[PDB]
């Protein structure tokens with residue numbers, strides 16, 4: 432599935 | 445930032461560093477920003493007002509140092525540069541000090557998520573934390589008001605939100621502060637944002653999310669007693685943000 436969906440605003444990894 | 449600690453981008457993955465090219469060869473730092481969505485960074489209009497030539501700016505994501513590279517960083521050009529039209533500056537305050545930058549890499553893409561690149565959340569309409577909340581600010585701005593150079597390592601610090609009643613006291617800023625601004629200070633006036641920090645984020649936890657509560661805008665001096673830092677109140681610009689992104 433596409434890279435963008437991995438953004439999760441506010442999350443520090 | 446006056447005070448604070450040095451940090452790395454992993455601790456502020458939504459921080460964007462904006463530079464200006466002088467074809468003479470040098471690239472200088474201008475301001476900070478925050479990544480809102482893959483292709484949009486939000487900053488402050490006053491950082492661009494004097495030179496609204498989008499083609500001369502460069503935006504980097506995943507950067508922990510100012511002039512050396514960080515592994516994982518991404519470089520972008522500014523496809524669109526949107527300033528607020530009602531931006532106005534007076535003797536101290538900047539009004540409607542918010543700007544949007546649409547970014548594009550040389551391959552033609554927007555940002556991709558990594559352990560050093562993440563978006564930050566936007567608040568819900570007119571929703572803010574209550575005064576007293578501790579929020580953090582990050583940036584490459586001055587460490588002392590008399591410095592004429594910016595640090596090479598990214599810095600961060602914690603400040604608390606104060607009420608408008610407190611900030612509008614005649615001996616603070618009076619009516620220079622409006623309902624579209626937020627003031628944040630250190631109880632002991634020891635740490636604060638400063639020159640070079642404009643455009644960057646004031647992040648607070650709101651409803652369980654790290655939210656972009658403010659954008660560094662102005663202040664009298666840096667870390668001065670009774671002179672809090674003033675930020676653009678993001679929650680009051682949501683319609684504006686939505687209309688352009």
Ligand SMILES: N=C(N)c1ccc(NC(=O)c2ccccc2O)cc1
Nearest residue numbers: 637638639640641642663665666673
């Ligand atoms: N006391 C504060 N919290 C403060 C003071 C000044 C600035 N910044 C500036 O005055 C400034 C001016 C021009 C360009 C960039 C800046 O950061 C930012 C914060």
